[PDB]
Amino acid sequence: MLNSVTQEDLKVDRLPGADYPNPSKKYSSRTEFRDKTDYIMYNPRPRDEPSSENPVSVSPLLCELAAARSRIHFNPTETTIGIVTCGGICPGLNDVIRSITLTGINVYNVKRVIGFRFGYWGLSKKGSQTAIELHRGRVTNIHHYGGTILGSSRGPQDPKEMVDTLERLGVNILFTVGGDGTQRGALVISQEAKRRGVDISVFGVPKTIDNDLSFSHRTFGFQTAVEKAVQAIRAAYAEAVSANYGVGVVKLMGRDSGFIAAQAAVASAQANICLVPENPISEQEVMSLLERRFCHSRSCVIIVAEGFGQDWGLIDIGVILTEKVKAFLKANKSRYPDSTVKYIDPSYMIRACPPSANDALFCATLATLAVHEAMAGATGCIIAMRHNNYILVPIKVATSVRRVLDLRGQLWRQVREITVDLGSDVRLARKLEIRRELEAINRNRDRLHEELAKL
Amino acid sequence: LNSVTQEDLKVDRLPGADYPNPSKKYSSRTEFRDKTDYIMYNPRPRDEPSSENPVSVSPLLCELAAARSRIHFNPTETTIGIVTCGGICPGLNDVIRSITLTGINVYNVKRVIGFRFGYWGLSKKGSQTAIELHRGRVTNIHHYGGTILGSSRGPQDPKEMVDTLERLGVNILFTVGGDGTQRGALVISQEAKRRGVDISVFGVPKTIDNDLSFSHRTFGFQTAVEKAVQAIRAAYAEAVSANYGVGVVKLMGRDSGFIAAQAAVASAQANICLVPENPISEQEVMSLLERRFCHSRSCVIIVAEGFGQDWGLIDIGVILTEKVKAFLKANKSRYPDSTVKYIDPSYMIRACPPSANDALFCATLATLAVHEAMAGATGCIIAMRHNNYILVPIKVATSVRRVLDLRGQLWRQVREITVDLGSDVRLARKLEIRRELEAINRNRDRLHEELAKL
Amino acid sequence: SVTQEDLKVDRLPGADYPNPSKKYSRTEFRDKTDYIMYNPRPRDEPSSENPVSVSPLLCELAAARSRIHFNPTETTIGIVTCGGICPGLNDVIRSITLTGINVYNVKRVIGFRFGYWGLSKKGSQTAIELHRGRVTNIHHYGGTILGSSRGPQDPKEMVDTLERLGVNILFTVGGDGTQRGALVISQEAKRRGVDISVFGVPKTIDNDLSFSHRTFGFQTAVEKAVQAIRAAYAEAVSANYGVGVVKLMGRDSGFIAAQAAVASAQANICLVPENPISEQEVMSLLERRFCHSRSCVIIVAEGFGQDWGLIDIGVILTEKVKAFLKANKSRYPDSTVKYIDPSYMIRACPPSANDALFCATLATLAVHEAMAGATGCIIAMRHNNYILVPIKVATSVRRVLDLRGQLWRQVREITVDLGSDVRLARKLEIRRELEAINRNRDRLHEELAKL
Amino acid sequence: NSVTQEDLKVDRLPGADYPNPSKKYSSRTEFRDKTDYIMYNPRPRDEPSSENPVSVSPLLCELAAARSRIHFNPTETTIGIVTCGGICPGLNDVIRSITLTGINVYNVKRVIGFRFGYWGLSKKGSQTAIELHRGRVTNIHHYGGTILGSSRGPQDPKEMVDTLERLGVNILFTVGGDGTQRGALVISQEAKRRGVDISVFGVPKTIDNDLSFSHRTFGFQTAVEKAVQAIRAAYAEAVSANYGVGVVKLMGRDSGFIAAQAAVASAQANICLVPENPISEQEVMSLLERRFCHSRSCVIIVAEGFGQDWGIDIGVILTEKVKAFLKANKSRYPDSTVKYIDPSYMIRACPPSANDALFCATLATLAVHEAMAGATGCIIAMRHNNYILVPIKVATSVRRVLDLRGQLWRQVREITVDLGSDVRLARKLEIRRELEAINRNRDRLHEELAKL
Ligand SMILES: Nc1ncnc2c1ncn2[C@@H]1O[C@H](COP(=O)(O)O)[C@@H](O)[C@H]1O
Ligand SMILES: Nc1ncnc2c1ncn2[C@@H]1O[C@H](COP(=O)(O)O)[C@@H](O)[C@H]1O
Ligand SMILES: Nc1ncnc2c1ncn2[C@@H]1O[C@H](COP(=O)(O)O)[C@@H](O)[C@H]1O
Ligand SMILES: Nc1ncnc2c1ncn2[C@@H]1O[C@H](COP(=O)(O)O)[C@@H](O)[C@H]1O
């Protein structure tokens, strides 16, 4: 499916012609704009052992790098930019709206920037009345608060009606901020526009807090969601450690992927069990890990992605896991007397907020390069990040496959180093830990008796 | 330089891997590594896209860090030492905690020792103060700033220090510190080899400035940016609250501008960003200020501590503030009742617990450092490039300092948000008035309509 | 019904020792009991003579005393934390310990583990020695280093433990249940003629203590509640006809819901147990908000609407708002409802700076007054001063929002009313906005003429 | 205080001809028919008797509340707002709550924001004045500074009342310090002289919490929150060094309220230096050397107003002198380190704490209630947990300062180092307490280990 992917699948569509010079006065000289397309390897691992001659990629694939171009497709002073935000909100939405608007105006001096309201609905004939004019002063402070100043909706709309609106308002570039659904719909707008011979770029900024985009290592807002998940885990840990046989359960977003659950688990440094849809395990296996933790520890923290254990009945795995942990501890009152289970569901608090500084940097940079490349005629593509570089990826290939935790990858390996195992001798482990602690006590006893001898 | 060879990147291994990895953390024993895996130093292709697979611009391959099938040290007889040197940095306690817990929870090591107050803690007098790091001692240390071991800047006698490592039975010393510390670490490694003593010395790079070669990110850097942004928000609030207000923020960056540059973009409020890599004159700075003040009533200036050392080691924050005040006083006629507010957050950007993303990074660096030291790696540091954890010999890592690429992606992003001298500011304001009048008129129309149906 | 005798704070017999504190001259310790008025409102108009209280009642002020009941170098302090955790618990443990050691140089400080269970014969084995180095950093994280439990224990068994370990002062950190049990320990100790102060630090995040304006951790719970409301508002304002529902703690009182509502500055409806209103009245307020606004934020205390069918009012209110909006798709098309329950996140955290100050001060004065023989009482705050209140009166009556008080009045100024003409209001607001647009249009056409 | 009940009598514009239009309260009984009072000092003069207690002070302060009858006709009323002096956390919250109370409660005709302090009411400056409608203030509470802007300067009172007349302003809210409120009283009096119907009503802005007839000013608690952030950093630097010293300078030109509360709130302070308690260079170094007897780190908090006799930036000077002292004593304190943090404007140029947002909204809301009800020449303040009105004249006569015999300063001294206590005896007893812990732990561990 992913080994099915060819260099042609990664070839980024360009509208015909680059007839205008880049007006940007932001770089030192004109040599810092790009004459030609530069690439980066999809997989920078070598195929063979080190030789005398240079290394060769395991993969045939090259990803197009995003940068400001010498020659652009759209005449800046006649260009109108449209922005639309679709689906659930995500930290940094306002940062993206702000940076598209300011890059369009401060760098390219575009005629006009339009904000379509409440998702694709804003491009319907009735909805287009609500469209707002984004001037520089309108976006100055929007990055301080959560949500989208434009609003969102999950619905699709009639592509014919939507391209009617883009024509009527003279929109030459539409930036679609949304998930796979939105970008699939964006590609349909691009194709309807081409069919009518209308000069319109449609350019996607991927919005998925779950970080489940293929050809991508990081989507905007994900790191912020982890920051907030850690806040919920700290609370769960405080509840759990404050009880004799205390259990803290945190449910986090992750419908089909466990990236938030896994990173939050490691980042918290307090997680004992981490449950993700990629690693389905039974009720009985979970309770085994709990009873193992309780052998020589009096508290347990369980992180569960909302997508985990859908076969345990779209159902609330947080409530169900909490019931089953309570049921298990009640069945074993003799071993775990006066046990307590505390459940935390931070739900929307991890996505409905302003971004972390690192996410603000990322949002601004994604938005800025998106405008550079759309001005330079890029269409039917998304901007993404891989191996620390900003790349362009056609929507078709990006929306064909969902990314998921590699259970043999680096992150999941780190999760297993901090969580409880069934393999290791827990009695032997406690025996050695008592020795390490007695050695500390005895060195302290000695250093103290010494200090006390000199008063 | 471009005179770096594959041999410069070859990571030293102590002789023998006689023990199986005891780790019970992974699903099966196939998830440990039989052989050394590599990643390209430069994953850009040399030629245009062909029929055959792409080829690196660079000959160089960096060794990837991972848990190994076979390890050099007998876990239940192994003693780990930790020492923290130099200025503190967000995540120091996270690193101490993760070395300790990886050593104990994964490898079941005999003992973990924390040497106090840097290399001084391995001197004969200083070794009395060494503390026993058991699991219960490190449980909560990640909640607060600084180092539970303490630091010092000083070097010590390598002979005296290897005496201490022998006497206390230390098999692995983790050196958390800057180039100075890692150069000294390599000398400990070599003194140990000279005496035929079985000791790995393994570096965790500590530099908040993110100025490590063969590296894209050092621990604590992202946290320093988070705190720099806090100082810029304050500077902006002061500046925008005044008619012709100027906010000046000085940030760390002795020889590099990574913190200044990322904080500038991350704040989204910066107008001028001054870094040692791009020396410009007093007159050029005041030009950018006067340009900002053409059609704006506030200006925010970020300055790295290393910028403008030629302006007559010296506090560029205080000097830049004096000169901006002097310039605005000389021009009261154009800029009446101007205000200049100076913020130096200094140690507040490094003396704190890490961001979540830095906690993840610290724990992962520390964990892989223990895997690789157990597996016999010595005279090297762990680092991050292109989103992967790699090993790099200390010799090459300490030969050259990393610095902003003025033609790189970050510095390009800084210039998109900051003031330029090239663009017509009168034309720009003319067009912005048009865009704003169009907004006002569409709103005026939607309102006259809503009002007709009330 | 409360009399001056109900407020008389019990003192153990004798003050035979000088206060050893070298922190302050000796004139800054107190010779005699000082008081503050329960109600500092005047009975009569302003006169020639000084004003006179509406209330006969005087509350005893807390301060370090010249003469103390316990011999410091022979005194052992016990600490126990009971019930659900609360922001600043570790700050209180830390300040009791450091005041005991740094100020009074007490022999020993013992931390009983997991609530009153820690003073049972089996539980007392787990008791920990609180020396100065053990508490240095505990204020950086949430929960209690001692642990908690809800259970009571045999008072006879517990006073056995206090005798065996030589505990002279037990600090009981907990709610009314805990302090009622604390008073029983105090009385069992007196019955056996054993020299033991039992002194309460009130733990209730709900701020529902009588003879009190503020309990520790409450302001921190509000800080975290506001975080949940900001998220609810971001969800709601990002939707056409969006509704954000936040459930907050408040089993019997609405202090958190009310303060969070005002502090957020984003609340449209605030539902508290003190003001029971019907499903139909709530939906009336929603439909009123939606007349000329596209978002609504609803704060609901967990104790509100228990007659709507112990039950999760957050889930039930959310279902009913969804049901109401679905029944009215014609007026509110593509409406969305987002529910946030921050639950334990508002109590399982380190305190705000203002709560750290409060916790340290409560704990420090608690140690001063227990050393000075105070027993069977709690320390509390009224009218910006630290006071002592006997447990008996403090545990007789629960405090609840005054619907005619200053806070609830402020909640109603920011929330939607049924009384006002919404059409007239929108008419005038369009005028105010058009005046802004027209002045801006003029200032811009001018600036542009001189470019 | 030579202060009399007459000094506290709050001026009312003549007439209350309009009913309160507020539909926010359940019924009309929740508005106030008459002025209610609270005692300046609620401490009793005599011991508990049969009869009710009597105040030590003759003074009664007027309580702030929404009134049954108001002076200004709401639908013809224009509110002006001006922000003067250095910014302070919650400025935008105050602008927002004045605007929303004016519009949502009273349905006032118009709200005007004068820009860059009193300058905005000058004839040239009034061109820049902005229209505050409901939509303009929705989100301003999320960020620091003032959307109106500030300046320190006074202006011609004649010119300013000219502007208020021309624009039809009936209420001017003056957000600023004593300087601003003194100038506000002059506007009030110039308006009265011309027989023009104008309330001038002050919202006190001082982060230092140095207002008389007041226990808390808006933004103070937020400044403490941020000061603690600087102290945590200082402590991390200091504890990470052998003989480490962290020095934090905080605002406090004439008062030490921020320094004192930050010291206690941080729980990490060893020395706290405030202008109210001037002590010598030699006395400071005595406290440092005492801390270093049995501790390896010291945190020193210094208010900017401390040690003006030291012969100016007290932060830089104290740091130099501590370095000089430790260098003179290398033998006792080898490889010592001193780290200086000046958070300066970071403690005031930010959005408020939740508790300060509550306070700002409440101050602003009651300010509008009372100005609509004809109050003028006064400020709103908080004492003993209640909102009160205080004439500007008395409020601007005297500065408030730490009581060195008061409750807060006593709490500072409980946590800081003393010279009086036997440090050898103290360490002896602390080693005993720690050995008792070690021995109980050694026992519990040998036991657990015997049963595996
Ligand atoms: N290598 C590691 N890095 C970071 N956190 C870890 C690591 N190993 C374990 N942890 C976490 O740290 C906690 C230590 O507390 P405890 O398990 O009670 O000793 C464990 O519960 C894990 O949640
Ligand atoms: N492309 C961009 N992305 C992010 N921040 C930017 C960008 N362009 C400008 N900014 C910042 O946004 C601010 C907007 O304020 P103003 O220029 O006063 O409208 C500028 O001063 C910059 O600091
Ligand atoms: N006097 C006030 N003080 C503080 N917040 C208020 C006040 N009046 C209203 N609010 C809040 O501020 C919001 C203003 O935004 P909007 O209602 O959309 O105009 C209201 O919905 C209330 O939550
Ligand atoms: N009663 C108290 N309440 C709060 N903080 C205190 C108290 N006594 C001392 N402190 C602070 O707690 C710190 C404890 O660290 P140490 O002095 O090393 O034990 C002291 O340095 C003071 O800053």
Side-chain angles (χ1 to χ4, degrees), chain B residues 243-257:
Chain B
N243 198 48
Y244 297 118
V246 181
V248 181
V249 188
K250 185 182 92 175
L251 297 175
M252 283 167 182
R254 257 178 216 143
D255 298 299
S256 51

Side-chain angles (χ1 to χ4, degrees), chain B residues 266-280:
Chain B
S267 75
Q269 283 165 329
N271 301 122
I272 306 171
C273 185
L274 305 178
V275 300
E277 298 89 333
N278 185 35
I280 65 172

Side-chain angles (χ1 to χ4, degrees), chain A residues 98-99 102-103 106 136 140 364 368, chain B residues 268-271 292 416-417:
Chain A
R98 186 173 182 283
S99 283
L102 293 178
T103 299
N106 293 338
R136 185 190 212 219
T140 305
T368 300
Chain B
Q269 283 165 329
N271 301 122
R292 174 55 173 177
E416 317 263 43
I417 81 162

Side-chain angles (χ1 to χ4, degrees), chain C residues 25-40:
Chain C
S25 281
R26 282 188 207 155
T27 359
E28 274 204 76
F29 301 82
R30 294 261 202 85
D31 285 7
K32 63 170 194 89
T33 292
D34 296 351
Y35 292 84
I36 193 192
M37 292 165 196
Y38 174 78
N39 188 353

Side-chain angles (χ1 to χ4, degrees), chain D residues 278-297:
Chain D
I279 65 172
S280 62
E281 171 173 354
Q282 289 194 339
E283 285 174 82
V284 170
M285 300 316 152
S286 291
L287 295 167
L288 173 54
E289 102 178 293
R290 203 73 172 333
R291 176 53 174 178
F292 275 175
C293 275
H294 293 296
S295 222
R296 283 317 156 97
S297 68

